[PDB]
Amino acid sequence: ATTLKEAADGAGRDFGFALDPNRLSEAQYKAIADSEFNLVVAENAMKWDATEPSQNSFSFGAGDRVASYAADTGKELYGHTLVWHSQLPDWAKNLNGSAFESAMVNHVTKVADHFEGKVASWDVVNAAFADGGGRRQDSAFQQKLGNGYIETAFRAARAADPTAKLCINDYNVEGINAKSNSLYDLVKDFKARGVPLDCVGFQSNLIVGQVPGDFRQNLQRFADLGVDVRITELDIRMRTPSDATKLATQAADYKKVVQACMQVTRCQGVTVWGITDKYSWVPDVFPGEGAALVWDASYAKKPAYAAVMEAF
Ligand SMILES: *[C@H]1O[C@H](CO)[C@@H](O[C@@H]2O[C@H](CO)[C@@H](O)[C@H](O)[C@H]2O)[C@H](O)[C@H]1O
């Protein structure tokens, strides 16, 4: 094809990106955003802190901008995220018992209700499991509400929006390990009990060369549970600077990940976390690392571009 949009389009898959609405005013960014993707998710606009800064005082400004961009260009809209322990506004953290549960339910209801009909799928709960299996210990949701907060959130989301696909999202669950084994048990139990859950999202903030060789097998075992699977946040960081060897590996890595999704009939698509390395979140949390995206800081197509196109 001519673009990754058409490559993905022809494969019947989604290929998305994390949008920062403030960047649509940089011509080069919009040009790429417009032509190379078929799905979009808000990078930060739809999180709890961005949407409910004070209790019951909602701010859908940035959220709507992203949603409007999707409808105006004809792209699918992915929602991220309703419940996530990180970046939980301070007012929520200081709540407890029923008052905390009430705030969670109200946040879920209101945010899902506002975007009803626009958002096709939602990341209802994000990062609930601990690396090493079991439930995340440092989550205010887990501490205050116990094991059942997840089922509560999913039931509230479905109550507010009857048609959006409800997904459970997590990172470091790409391969078969103790954390994905725990996730797998939650998904099996939910489907058995009739708890509304339609998909499983796999983050995938990988490092160049450390791509689990059993990605497919893992993606496929979830699919068999009766849910859709998707890669919700891809990037392959490296130690900078980069050279013709790091990029050539990373190019191979993108191809593996996209290729694993293609082999699982229920893998809806791949979503890359940004457009250009210029605005990547990596340098800020991983000092010394970066160059994780498909486009460099000068909007040049890195080798990974041709790899993703081939993978589709
Ligand atoms: C996958 O991890 C990325 C980066 O760690 C998250 O996006 C970033 O979130 C932080 C905090 O909310 C922001 O500072 C960045 O602008 C944003 O790119 C995803 O939310 C997460 O799912």
Rg (CA), the chain: 19
How far does the centroid of ligand 1 lie from the alpha carbon of residue 281, in Å? 7
Which atom belonging to ligand 1 lies closest to the Cα atom of 47? 12
For residue 167, what is the enclosing H or E element? strand 165-170
CATH number at residue 241: 3.20.20.80
Residue 127's region, left for phi above 0, alpha for psi from -120 to 50, else beta, is: left
Q: What angle do CA 266, 15, 61 make, to 5 degrees?
A: 115
Neighbouring CB atoms inside 10 A of 130's CB total 17
> Does the beta carbon of 87 sit less than 6 angstroms from any atom of ligand 1?
yes
Q: What is the DSSP letter of 37?
A: -
HEC states along 208-252?
Answer: CCCCCCCHHHHHHHHHCCCCEEEEEEEEEEEECCCCCCHHHHHHH
Q: In the chain, how many domains are there?
A: 1
Residue 62 is encoded by which pair of tokens? Answer: 């940035």
Neighbouring CB atoms inside 10 A of 34's CB total 15
Cβ(247)–Cβ(304) under 8 Å?
Answer: yes
How far does the centroid of ligand 1 lie from the alpha carbon of residue 241, in Å? 22
Among candidate residues 182, 163, 235, 229, the one with its CA nearest the CA of residue 202: 229
CA dihedral 201, 12, 4, 305 (to 10 degrees): 60
Question: Best of 168, 205, 273 to mutate for ligand 1, by most ligand atoms within 8 A of CB?
Answer: 273
HEC states along 89-143?
Answer: CHHHHCCCHHHHHHHHHHHHHHHHHHCCCCCCEEEEEECCECCCCCECCCCHHHH
Cβ-in-10-Å burial (0-12, 13-18, 19+) of 137 comes to: exposed
Output the residue whose Cα is nearest ligand 1's atom 11. Answer: 87
In whole angstroms, give the CA distance from residue 191 to residue 196.
7
Residue 54 is encoded by which pair of tokens? Answer: 């004070």
> Does the beta carbon of 43 sit less than 6 angstroms from any atom of ligand 1?
yes
Residue 300 is encoded by which pair of tokens? Answer: 């040049």
CB neighbours of 245 closer than 8 A, spacing ≥ 6? none
Query: 257-273 burial by CB neighbour count: b if 16+ within 10 A, else e?
Result: bbbbbeebebbbbbbbb
> Does the beta carbon of 205 sit less than 6 angstroms from any atom of ligand 1?
yes
How many CA atoms lie less than 13 Å away from 276 in the CB half-sphere? 17
Instruction: Say how far residue 273 (Cα) sits from the centre of its chain.
Output: 8
- Reported structure resolution in angstroms: 1.8
How far does the centroid of ligand 1 lie from the alpha carbon of residue 217, in Å? 27
Q: What is the DSSP letter of 165?
A: E
> Does the beta carbon of 281 sit less than 6 angstroms from any atom of ligand 1?
yes
Cβ(309)–Cβ(262) under 8 Å?
Answer: no
Residue 216 is encoded by which pair of tokens? Answer: 């497919």
Write the CA distances from 212 to 94, 175, 252, 267, integer angstroms.
39, 6, 13, 17
CB neighbours of 130 closer than 8 A, spacing ≥ 6? 136, 137, 179
In whole angstroms, give the CA distance from residue 4 to residue 310.
9
Write the CA distances from 231 to 12, 42, 269, 270, integer angstroms.
15, 15, 7, 5
Question: Sign of torsion, CA 123 128 134 135?
Answer: negative
> Does the beta carbon of 233 sit less than 6 angstroms from any atom of ligand 1?
yes
Write the CA distances from 80 to 126, 154, 178, 218, integer angstroms.
9, 14, 25, 23
Which atom belonging to ligand 1 lies closest to the Cα atom of 86? 12
How far does the centroid of ligand 1 lie from the alpha carbon of residue 282, in Å? 9
How far does the centroid of ligand 1 lie from the alpha carbon of residue 193, in Å? 32
Question: Phi, psi at residue 283, to the nearest 5°?
Answer: -55, -25
HEC states along 181-213?
Answer: HHHHHHHHHHHHHCCCCCEEEECCEEECCCCCC
In whole angstroms, give the CA distance from residue 88 to residue 247.
36
How far does the centroid of ligand 1 lie from the alpha carbon of residue 192, in Å? 32
For residue 81, whether the previous peptide bond is cis, meaning omega lies within 30 degrees of 0, is yes
In whole angstroms, give the CA distance from residue 247 to residue 274.
17
The experimental method is: X-ray
In whole angstroms, give the CA distance from residue 272 to residue 295.
11
Residue 230 is encoded by which pair of tokens? Answer: 């998707």
How far does the centroid of ligand 1 lie from the alpha carbon of residue 285, in Å? 10
In whole angstroms, give the CA distance from residue 236 to residue 249.
10
**Rounded to 5, what percent of the chain is helix, strand, coil?**
45, 20, 35
Give the range of the structural domain holding residue 137, as residue numbers without chain letter.
Answer: 1-312
Instruction: Say how far residue 255 (Cα) sits from the centre of its chain.
Output: 19
In whole angstroms, give the CA distance from residue 54 to residue 67.
22
Query: 94-119 burial by CB neighbour count: b if 16+ within 10 A, else e?
Result: ebeeeebbebbbebbbbbbebbeebb
In whole angstroms, give the CA distance from residue 36 to residue 3.
5
Cβ(201)–Cβ(122) under 8 Å?
Answer: no
